[PDB]
From Swiss-Prot, chain B:
It is a single-pass type I membrane protein; Single-pass membrane protein. The N-terminus is a hydrophobic fusion peptide that inserts into the target host membrane. It is buried in the center of the trimer cavity before cleavage by host furin. The coiled coil (heptad repeat) regions are probably involved in homotrimerization, heterodimerization and in the formation of a fusion-active hairpin structure. It comes from Human respiratory syncytial virus A (strain A2). Residues 22-60 form a coiled coil. Class I viral fusion protein. Under the current model, the protein has at least 3 conformational states: pre-fusion native state, pre-hairpin intermediate state, and post-fusion hairpin state. During viral and plasma cell membrane fusion, the coiled coil regions assume a trimer-of-hairpins structure, positioning the fusion peptide in close proximity to the C-terminal region of the ectodomain. The formation of this structure appears to drive apposition and subsequent fusion of viral and cellular membranes leading to delivery of the nucleocapsid into the cytoplasm. Homotrimer. Heterodimer with fusion protein F2; disulfide-linked. Interacts with host NCL; this interaction plays a role in viral entry into the host cell. As a heterodimer with F2, interacts with host heparan sulfate. As a heterodimer with F2, interacts with host IGF1R; this interaction activates PRKCZ/PKCzeta that recruits NCL/nucleolin from the host nucleus to the plasma membrane. Part of a complex composed of F1, F2 and G glycoproteins. As a heterodimer with F2, interacts with host RHOA; this interaction facilitates virus-induced syncytium formation. It comes from the Viruses. Residues 1-21 are annotated as: Fusion peptide. The lineage of its organism: Viruses, Riboviria, Orthornavirae, Negarnaviricota, Haploviricotina. It is found in: Virion membrane; Host cell membrane. This is Fusion glycoprotein F1.
């Protein structure tokens, strides 16, 4: 049982964008398919539904006339075409399976996909620039000194930051992103390590930004 | 003599309906897991109706 969704991204207000969702593991041709969106940090919002035969489509009032739902049972896909997008449409969209099979009355969602993020902001997509927050040379001999990475000027969210490709996890703090005055995001990832370890073990942070296909490895040295 | 005035209907439509819902990918594993414990169990079918299920013979 699996619903894999695709087609997300960033799209300027007023333009169009089509989401697709492929199903595998069940008799897709007999289940009604829902589209349900969720704004960042807010609750769930029902978007649309299409019956098992594809001859009954229902849309929410806030997306009526703009969105259009379609299905293809020969390939087990559901497509949601959204044109004339407002900024309030920025959300994470799930495709979901209807609990009850082979009906014209729709009941609820029991199998949910992972979702596709749709951002409407007029700003473009920019990969992040990674700057090293290098350890101070005053650090005591003991001494528990600290270093890190500054992931600056990226859009949209999110970026994932690891250390030594995951080999370093203890004492790592990756802060939540902040929205800079430029309209782009920025965060910091800091690690506290024994001062006697500097100059002996290589410290590299790995920054990943999927929306821009950006993979950065930043080596931090004193 | 008035046998022609009555309407015609499908006698096994309910059983055929229960069969068509059992052909879905899965739904057999549902019954198998339900009957894993005892020989009788109520199972909620994918069409919503809950039906009683018996394991009348254990050959495996």
């Amino acid at each position: 049982v699996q619903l894999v969704e695709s087609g997300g991204g960033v799209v300027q207000p007023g333009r169009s964008l089509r989401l697709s969702c492929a199903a595998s593991g069940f008799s897709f041709s007999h289940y009604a398919m829902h589209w349900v969106r969720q704004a960042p940090g807010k609750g769930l919002e029902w978007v649309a539904v299409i019956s098992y035969d594809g001859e009954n489509t229902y849309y929410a009032d806030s997306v009526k006339g703009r969105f259009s739902i379609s299905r293809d049972n020969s390939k087990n896909t559901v497509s949601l075409q959204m044109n004339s997008l407002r900024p309030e449409d920025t959300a994470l969209y799930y495709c979901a399976r209807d609990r009850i099979v082979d009906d014209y009355y729709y009941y609820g969602m029991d199998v949910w996909g992972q979702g596709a993020t749709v951002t409407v902001s007029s700003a473009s997509t920019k990969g992040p620039s990674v700057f090293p927050l290098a350890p101070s040379s005053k650090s005591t001999s003991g001494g528990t000194a600290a270093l890190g990475c500054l992931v600056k000027d990226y859009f949209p969210e999110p970026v994932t930051v690891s250390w030594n490709s995951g080999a370093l996890t203890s004492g790592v703090h990756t802060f939540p992103a902040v929205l800079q005055s430029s309209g782009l995001y920025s965060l910091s990832s800091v690690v506290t390590v024994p001062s006697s370890s500097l100059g002996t073990q290589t410290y590299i942070c790995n920054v990943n930004h999927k929306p821009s296909n950006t993979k950065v490895d930043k080596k931090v040295e004193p | 003599f008035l046998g022609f005035l009555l309407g015609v209907g499908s006698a096994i439509a309910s059983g055929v309906a229960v069969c068509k819902v059992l052909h879905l990918e899965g739904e057999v594993n549902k019954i198998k897991s339900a009957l894993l414990s005892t020989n009788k169990a109520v199972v909620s079918l994918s069409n919503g109706v809950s039906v009683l299920t018996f394991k009348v013979l254990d050959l495996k």
